[PDB]
Design a protein around this ligand. Structure first.
Ligand SMILES: Nc1ncnc2c1ncn2[C@@H]1O[C@H](COP(=O)(O)OP(=O)(O)O)[C@@H](O)[C@H]1O
Ligand SMILES: [Mg+2]
Ligand SMILES: [Zn+2]
Lengths: 528, 210, 159
RNA sequence: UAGUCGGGUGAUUAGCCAGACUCUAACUUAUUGAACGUAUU
């Protein structure tokens, strides 16, 4: 129609797509360019012209929340609060919404997930129904994609309907355009506390193919990842790379060259091995000579893992024992995945799973990890030592620069690495009637952990329930009661402080300082 | 908290009369510059730097509707009902969080010197002053409880940190008393005590220095 | 919505609602108007509009119970920091009603096409209609177009 | 910085120039009906 033509020529993606569907060249190319166009910035990072992220979330009578609004950052949002403030509820609400995009990218008219009629409606809500309303942005040509998931409580005779058509409309553009000519697709993932699990290599899932592109959407919002799928996929990649003869020739050529250098260096014992390898190389060359995309995919993921996971410097597959084993160099030692600590394994699992999915869904990017998507992570500090908590957000954002991260944490150490604008904080005595979340007053990025504890997390830097925590205060008060002179009582407490904290303790130095200052103040008073 | 000097009364309080008028009616931008002259851009009770700030009725408008448009009764307190919820000291807590209190048993900083009642330890607690009994103790105790001067972790933290920053300089000045003649050392202490009028938590810094 | 009586009945049914909310807003210096199901509130006072949504919900429940409800997804706050529009009309930062930059640029595009005889009859008719609307909302824009494009061209177009 | 407003240029829904704004905070919508603008009469 002429109206659609005008809007489409103005840059409206939905109008362009409608014109494409009715006529089924011009309009197709508009849609495809809208999705694929972008540029490399000054830092060498690819940036899509049309970004995709969650802008705003509204919760009505959902779990603890009567009516709550959250504005999200395009890049990173961190939600903080005490246990029971609804941080996980917020992530669950978002994950259910995203399930509608995933379902419709996989299948026309696919069904996403639903709010629970048993648990998700606020217990004391007079209207016995709940609403989760989201708005997504996809460039200037599609500034608002509104979705509502709704559910009525189990007894209730009126039933409240969800509104998911806009999600389906956008997902249809991705699916249809991709079918005609391949495009990069968005990644959606949820990593909740269920990501901590025992590993068993023995169990293999025989449901679908791990090399098939849309397997990247399999259980993507289930909370755990599929680390098993990663391992299967990685072994697959390895087998294909080893089976490619030219890379094997190149690898064999490199091995022959390395062995020849050793023989030239005076090690005559390896001459027999060199001759064997030269024979193997000649045979490989003789066999019918023809870069595997599988080889590149493998390299990308290996680099991602090693860059993000601090203790891991290398990852590879061994088959020589007679079973396929993934091995890693962890803190300078070669180990199996099964031998990693739970903290290392769980974090490895997260990154491996995420990297795999991005590689599969972004085949046309030079760096597939620069793809688009929304990733939710609950309790990012789970099982991490403080040392690692100081690196984790920085590493993730470096590896995945165009993902919108929505994170929850209880860690001041994590908060010390993040800007205040990214932080959303619950009011201290909330009771689930606060209308809008806000950022803290203090700047967290680069600040001391003890300050973040007190100013942002509302916790004393010294434990108030321990008597020894009050001794210095009591000591000072005793000193001031006796005109600054150490009396019997003040001396006893001084000795207690010395005995408990030690001769080199900060606390004792403070006590000493108090003595010195007060003595000098008293002397001044006497002179006057 | 500081001994405040209430000096001159603004013109607008003459116009509005209690009973007829409500506090929602009166214009607040007329009232502020006289308070900002008195209070120095710092809170009446805690001495933070005012940024989110409201006019506070020392005796509240519910219990004392007679004492409403009275220049004695008004003070500039930290916090705001409007901009954000759940403020946890000073004006806002006196009403909401501090439950039952007799307003007679509170330090009014325009009338009284607080320094005779309150003591600021360098560890960052505020405590009753040394040797108080009966009513003088009860005022010190209830002022601390009702304005939440220890119980607000944000405030307890900020004050403790502010003092602990200066305690190298306090230590170092009182070593040099040995060496210098009196008039030079008395000038040095006069200077440091001059600077802290520009600072947050000025009472607590005074007690550390003096 | 399609019935000729529905506008009248709907306005009547909102009469008491309008009375109450208008009165309430006037006390706090908020301007209130309703265009069918679209409610607009504006003020020069900071931090007063935040209370309005809660007030609305209570009043709706009082008057209509659960029959009429706010669309919570459609509640939007704006200021002179951001785009402000009311029923398709842009309010610019000089407090003047405007078509908006993009619409004005589009109209200019169509006039330029007409100047070179490139507009089809359908587009021409469209352009003429849009200019009448522009004349009603932003007459100064028409003056500017006359200056930019020759009065003769524009008269020829509107004849 | 960013986003927004938009006076100008520009075979013109783009790009570029100029100036300005900033309550935590616009996402441009729907007919044949109703109302409004214009044309017709
Ligand atoms: N349907 C419900 N009605 C009321 N309160 C609920 C409901 N479901 C959960 N809650 C409350 O919500 C909180 C759950 O917090 P959760 O979402 O796990 O957040 P967090 O991860 O920050 O603890 C608990 O305080 C629980 O009592
Ligand atoms: Mg019509
Ligand atoms: Zn205060």
């Amino acid at each position: 129609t002429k109206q659609y033509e005008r809007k489409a020529k103005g840059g409206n993606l939905l109008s362009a797509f409608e014109l494409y569907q009715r006529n089924s060249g011009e309009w197709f190319e508009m849609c495809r360019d809208y999705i694929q166009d972008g540029h490399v910035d000054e830092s060498g990072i690819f940036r899509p012209d049309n970004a995709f992220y969650l802008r705003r979330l509204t919760l009505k009578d959902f779990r603890r929340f009567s009516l709550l609004e959250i504005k999200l950052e395009e890049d990173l949002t961190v939600i903080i609060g005490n246990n029971g403030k609804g941080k996980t509820s917020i992530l669950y609400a978002i994950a259910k919404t995203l399930s509608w995009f995933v379902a419709n990218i996989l299948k026309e008219g696919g069904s996403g997930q639903r709010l629970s009629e048993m648990t998700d409606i606020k217990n004391d809500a007079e209207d016995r129904y709940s609403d989760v309303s989201s708005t997504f942005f996809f460039g200037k040509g599609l500034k608002s994609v509104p979705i509502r998931l709704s559910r009525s409580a189990l007894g209730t005779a009126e039933r409240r309907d969800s509104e998911v058509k806009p999600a389906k409309d956008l997902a249809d553009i991705w699916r249809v355009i991709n079918e005609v000519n391949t495009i990069n697709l968005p990644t959606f993932a949820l990593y909740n506390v269920e990501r901590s699990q025992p590993f068993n290599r023995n169990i293999k899932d025989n449901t679908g193919r791990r090399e098939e592109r849309f397997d990247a959407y399999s259980q993507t919002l289930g909370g755990a990842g599929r680390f098993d799928h990663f391992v299967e996929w990685y072994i697959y990649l390895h087998k294909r790379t080893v089976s490619d003869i030219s890379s094997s020739i190149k690898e064999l050529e490199q091995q022959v060259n390395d062995l020849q250098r050793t023989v030239d260096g005076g090690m005559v014992s390896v001459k027999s091995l060199l001759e064997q390898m030269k024979f193997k190389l000649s045979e490989a060359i003789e066999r019918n000579d023809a870069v595997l995309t599988e080889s590149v995919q493998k390299s990308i993921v290996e680099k991602a893992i090693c860059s993000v996971v601090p203790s891991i410097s290398n990852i590879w597959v061994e088959m020589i024992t007679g079973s396929d084993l993934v091995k890693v160099t962890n803190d300078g030692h070669d180990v199996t995945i099964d031998q990693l600590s739970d903290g290392q394994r769980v974090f490895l699992s997260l990154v491996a799973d995420l990297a795999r999915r991005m590689v599969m869904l972004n085949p046309l990017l030079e760096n597939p990890l620069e793809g688009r998507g929304i990733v939710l992570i609950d309790e990012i500090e789970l099982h991490l030592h403080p040392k690692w908590q100081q690196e984790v957000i920085l590493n993730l954002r470096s590896a995945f620069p165009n993902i919108q991260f929505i994170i929850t944490t209880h860690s001041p150490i994590v908060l010390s690495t993040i800007e205040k604008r990214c932080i959303r904080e619950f009011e201290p005595n909330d009771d689930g009637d606060q209308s809008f979340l806000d950022s803290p007053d203090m700047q967290t990025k680069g600040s001391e952990n003890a300050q973040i504890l007190e100013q942002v997390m509302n916790v004393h830097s010294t434990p108030p329930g321990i008597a020894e925590s009050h001794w210095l205060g009591n000591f000072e008060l005793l000193l001031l009661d006796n005109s600054g002179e150490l009396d019997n009582h003040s001396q006893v407490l001084y000795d207690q402080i010395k005995a408990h904290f030690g001769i080199d303790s900060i606390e004792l130095k403070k006590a000493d300082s108090l003595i010195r200052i007060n003595k000098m103040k008293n002397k001044l008073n006497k002179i006057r | 908290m500081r001994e405040l000097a209430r000096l001159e009364r603004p013109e607008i309080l003459d116009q509005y009369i209690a009973g007829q008028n409500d506090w929602m009616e009166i214009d607040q931008s007329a009232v502020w510059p006289k308070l900002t002259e008195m209070q120095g851009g710092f809170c009446a009770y805690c001495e933070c730097r005012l940024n989110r700030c409201h006019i506070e009725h020392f005796r509240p408008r519910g219990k004392f509707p007679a004492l409403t448009f009275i220049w004695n009764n008004l003070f500039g307190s930290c916090g705001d009902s409007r901009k954000s919820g759940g403020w946890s000291r000073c004006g806002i807590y006196k009403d909401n969080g501090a439950g039952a209190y007799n307003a007679d048993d509170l330090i009014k900083p325009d009338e009284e010197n607080p320094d005779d009642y309150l003591l600021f330890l360098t560890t960052g607690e505020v405590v009753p002053a040394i040797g108080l009994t009966g009513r003088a103790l009860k005022k010190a105790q209830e002022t601390i409880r009702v304005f939440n001067l220890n119980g607000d972790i944000k405030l307890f933290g900020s004050r403790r940190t502010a003092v602990q920053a200066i305690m190298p300089n306090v230590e170092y000045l009182y070593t040099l008393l040995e060496e210098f003649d009196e008039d030079d050392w008395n000038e040095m202490l006069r200077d440091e005590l001059e600077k802290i009028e520009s600072d947050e938590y000025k009472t607590a810094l005074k007690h550390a220095w003096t | 919505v399609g019935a000729p009586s529905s506008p009248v009945i709907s306005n009547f049914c909102m009469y008491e609602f309008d009375n109450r909310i208008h009165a309430a807003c006037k006390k706090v210096e908020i301007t209130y108007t309703r265009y069918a199901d679209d409610l607009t509130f504006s003020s020069n006072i900071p931090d007063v509009l935040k209370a309005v949504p809660s007030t609305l919900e209570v009043l709706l429940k009082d008057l209509f119970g659960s029959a009429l409800r706010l669309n919570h997804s459609k509640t939007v706050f704006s200021s002179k920091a951001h785009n402000r529009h009311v029923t398709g009309i842009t309010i610019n930062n000089e407090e003047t009603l405007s078509l908006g930059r993009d619409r004005k640029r589009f109209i200019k595009h169509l006039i330029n096409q007409y100047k070179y005889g490139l507009l089809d009859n359908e587009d021409k008719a469209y352009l003429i209609g849009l200019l009448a609307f522009a004349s009603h909302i932003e007459p100064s824009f028409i003056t500017r177009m006359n200056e930019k494009y020759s009065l003769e061209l524009m008269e020829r177009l509107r004849g």
